[PDB]
Amino acid sequence: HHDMAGVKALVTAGGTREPLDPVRFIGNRSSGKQGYAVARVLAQRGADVTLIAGNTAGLIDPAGVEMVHIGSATQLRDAVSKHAPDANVLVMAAAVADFRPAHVAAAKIKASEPSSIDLVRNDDVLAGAVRARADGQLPNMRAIVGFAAEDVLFHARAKLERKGCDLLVVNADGWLLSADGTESALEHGSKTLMATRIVDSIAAFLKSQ
Amino acid sequence: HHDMAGVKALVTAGGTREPLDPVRFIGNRSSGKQGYAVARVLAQRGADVTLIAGNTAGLIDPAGVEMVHIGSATQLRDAVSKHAPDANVLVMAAAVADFRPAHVAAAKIKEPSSIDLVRNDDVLAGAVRARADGQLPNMRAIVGFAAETGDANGDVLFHARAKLERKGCDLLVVNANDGWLLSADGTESALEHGSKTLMATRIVDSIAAFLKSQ
Numbered sequence: 114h115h116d117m118a119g120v121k122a123l124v125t126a127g128g129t130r131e132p133l134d135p136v137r138f139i140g141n142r143s144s145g146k147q148g149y150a151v152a153r154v155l156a157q158r159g160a161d162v163t164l165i166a167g168n169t170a171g172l173i174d175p176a177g178v179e180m181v182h183i184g185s186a187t188q189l190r191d192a193v194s195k196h197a198p199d200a201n202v203l204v205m206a207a208a209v210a211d212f213r214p215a216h217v218a219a220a221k222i223k224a225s226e227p228s229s230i231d232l233v234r235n236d237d238v239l240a241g242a243v244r245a246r247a248d249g250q251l252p253n254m255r256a257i258v259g260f261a262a263e264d265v266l267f268h269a270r271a272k273l274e275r276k277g278c279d280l281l282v283v284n285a286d287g288w289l290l291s292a293d294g295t296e297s298a299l300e301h302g303s304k305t306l307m308a309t310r311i312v313d314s315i316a317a318f319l320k321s322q
Numbered sequence: 323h324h325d326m327a328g329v330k331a332l333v334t335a336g337g338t339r340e341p342l343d344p345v346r347f348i349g350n351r352s353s354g355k356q357g358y359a360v361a362r363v364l365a366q367r368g369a370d371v372t373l374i375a376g377n378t379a380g381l382i383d384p385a386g387v388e389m390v391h392i393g394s395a396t397q398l399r400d401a402v403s404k405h406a407p408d409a410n411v412l413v414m415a416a417a418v419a420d421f422r423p424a425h426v427a428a429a430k431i432k433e434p435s436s437i438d439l440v441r442n443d444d445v446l447a448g449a450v451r452a453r454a455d456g457q458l459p460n461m462r463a464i465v466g467f468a469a470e471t472g473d474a475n476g477d478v479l480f481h482a483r484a485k486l487e488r489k490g491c492d493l494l495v496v497n498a499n500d501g502w503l504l505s506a507d508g509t510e511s512a513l514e515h516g517s518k519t520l521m522a523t524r525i526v527d528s529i530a531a532f533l534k535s536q
């Protein structure tokens with residue numbers, strides 16, 4: 114029915130774009146459609162949803178959802194730090210870029226030997242939240258959900274353990290891993306059907322607390 | 323009303339994406355909207371339009387336009403080499419990536435090594451040379467695009483004119499009034515801002531004009 118009534122949820126979706134200069138960047142192919150699906154299903158089940166959106170300009174804003182638009186992985190981090198204290202549930206569906214150019218040209222780049230692009234690591238927003246909650250800075254946080262693309266279960270359970278989040282959605286082959294040792298598989302169906310299985314898992318996790 | 327009837331037009335639009343692995347890539351912010359609008363305005367005036375499209379702002383295939391979807395700059399070059407002998411008009415509105423990664427992983431990449439790069443071919447320049455070398459007998463108009471600005475190395479117009487001269491195309495459509503239509507005869511025409519549809523009309527009108535002089 115409306116099991117997420119009154120629940121404050123913060124969702125990230127899409128891929129980030131790390132500028133090389135004002136027009137070029139490093140991007141990824143994540144559509145963010147799956148992240149929009151969870152936000153939509155959450156708003157559909159009563160949650161007060163805020164959505165931070167990356168490279169998703171051609172998607173429809175989900176109904177009833179407060180939209181936050183970002184560009185790079187660092188802008189996403191700032192937006193998460195800004196909105197996370199108000200959330201009871203955080204869903205990190207963005208394909209956040211793992212690295213960024215070490216230098217950003219303030220102008221568009223233009224004849225002999227090609228340059229290489231030095232890289233620097235971007236901050237792990239999901240770990241930083243897991244740490245903030247463990248440091249008592251996120252008293253409202255009842256659920257932190259991560260995503261992973263990957264024996265997948267070997268990599269998946271190891272990644273769930275390293276992130277320290279409450280649930281890991283891997284391949285969304287597709288599985289719902291709980292820190293409780295629960296393993297469920299995600300029947301590869303529609304993005305709506307998988308967004309229902311995730312929120313089913315979230316509402317379920319919230320009740321055990 | 324149908325001035326491009328019987329004209330075979332080959333159009334490129336959008337930005338290319340140069341893969342590092344299956345999920346990451348190097349791209350640019352090109353929407354493809356002006357390139358699609360020219361393809362649309364060409365087909366509506368009777369042309370047999372083929373549109374080679376890379377990354378766009380989520381644009382819809384125009385009706386009555388033959389679509390070819392490409393990813394990287396090398397795939398765009400191959401697609402243009404394949405279709406150019408049949409085209410009478412080439413409109414290179416795509417932002418073709420000048421470089422691509424030296425190595426592509428077939429799987430994703432879990433300290434980091436920098437990204438080595440290798441240059442991509444200049445697809446528009448190769449078309450100008452092929453026609454000047456007689457390999458494109460049907461090609462009557464070659465059109466390039468440029469987004470230029472004024473900097474410590476020269477005013478926008480200087481950069482724009484230099485780009486027309488180095489490329490050697492018949493027309494250079496320059497954005498920066500919105501921009502310029504520079505012809506290979508030394509003709510220069512401001513591009514008045516309008517919708518992408520209206521500006522596509524001033525462009526095709528310029529192309530039709532050049533084709534009449536040709």
Ligand SMILES: Nc1ccn([C@@H]2O[C@H](COP(=O)(O)OP(=O)(O)OP(=O)(O)O)[C@@H](O)[C@H]2O)c(=O)n1
Pocket residue numbers: 186205206207208209210211235236237238239240258259260261262431432
């Ligand atoms: N800088 C980053 C990178 C990832 N994540 C989040 O952590 C999960 C990681 O996804 P994954 O693709 O596995 O990224 P990595 O943890 O870096 O793993 P790998 O590089 O091996 O793919 C996702 O929820 C993503 O939103 C994040 O918050 N900040």
Ligand SMILES: Nc1ccn([C@@H]2O[C@H](COP(=O)(O)OP(=O)(O)OP(=O)(O)O)[C@@H](O)[C@H]2O)c(=O)n1
Pocket residue numbers: 222223395414415416417418419420442443444445446447465466467468469485
């Ligand atoms: N590898 C490339 C690069 C550019 N172009 C084409 O050439 C025209 C001019 O693009 P532009 O990038 O403006 O020319 P460059 O010489 O790459 O510009 P710059 O030297 O300013 O970077 C465009 O129509 C584009 O489609 C191309 O065909 N192949």
Ligand SMILES: O=C(O)C(=O)c1cn(-c2ccc(O)cc2)c2ccc(-c3ccccc3)cc12
Pocket residue numbers: 133137222223228229230231337338339340348349350417418419420421439
């Ligand atoms: O030099 C040029 O004329 C030139 O176009 C480029 C130079 N870089 C570049 C070199 C080294 C580096 O560290 C950072 C950047 C480019 C990067 C990307 C693109 C591109 C990609 C996709 C679509 C369109 C354009 C084009 C260029």
Ligand SMILES: O=C(O)C(=O)c1cn(-c2ccc(O)cc2)c2ccc(-c3ccccc3)cc12
Pocket residue numbers: 335336337351352353354355356357358415416417418467468469495496497500501513521
């Ligand atoms: O079709 C589009 O709108 C698009 O994406 C464009 C990509 N380039 C482009 C960018 C860099 C480059 O090196 C090569 C090509 C453009 C250049 C000019 C214009 C344009 C021209 C006239 C009026 C309005 C816009 C539009 C594009």
Ligand SMILES: [Ca+2]
Pocket residue numbers: 209210211
């Ligand atoms: Ca990653």
Ligand SMILES: [Ca+2]
Pocket residue numbers: 420
């Ligand atoms: Ca260029």
